[PDB]
């Protein structure tokens, strides 16, 4: 219920999401998060096409890196230099031009100071 | 029938 990942401030975590590939509707994949009591917040999104978009929220720029492995149909989020304000549930979702579309289960992450 | 959109950065 309250079960999740626990990271010490300054530590790192990697997430992954399955990304079947580009359809007529969607041209990428990414993550958003929702902290207790707050609205959903964009985190990052990446295009299936190499070189098209790689978007980051201002709050994670320089600390998080999104990457794709199309040969494995996967995308990854490397979350470095984690801080307490990164505590949230992290959700993967298909992207269209960078925006994320959730058409209904996340990964709960607690970062201590 | 319904969708949640989380917009990329402005």
Residue numbers in the entry:
A (entry chain A): 8 to 111, 116 to 124
B (entry chain B): 304 to 313
What does the article say, verbatim?
Substitution G115E (mutant 1), which was the most frequent in the initial set of mutants, improved drastically the kon by itself, leading to the best overall affinity (23 nM) measured in this screen. G115 in Z70 is in a flexible loop (from F110 to G117) that is partially not resolved in the structure (from D111 to G115), whereas E115 electron density in mutant 20 was well defined. Similarly, in mutant 1, this loop remained partially unresolved but some partial electron density can be observed for E115, even if not sufficient to permit a residue replacement. G115 in Z70 or mutant 3 and E115 in mutant 1 were thus not modeled in the structures due to the high flexibility of this loop region. Mutant 1 with the introduction of a glutamic acid residue at position 115 had an improved kon and very little structural or conformational dynamics differences with Z70, which argue for a charge effect facilitating the interaction with the basic tau protein. Although there were few sequence differences between the individual VHH mutants, their thermal stability temperature range spanned about 15 °C. The G115E substitution in mutant 1 had little effect on VHH stability, with a loss of thermal stability of around 2 °C. To conclude on the mutation analysis, the charge effect provided by the G115E mutation had the greatest interest because it positively affected the affinity for the epitope without destabilizing the VHH or decreasing its intracellular solubility. Accordingly, the additional charges in mutant 1 might account for its excellent intracellular solubility, whereas its neutralization by the salt bridge could result in the poorer solubility in cells of mutant 20. In contrast, mutants 1 (G115E) and 3 (R47K) showed the best behaviors in the different assays conducted here and could be good candidates as intracellular antibodies for further testing in in vivo experiments as improved versions of Z70.
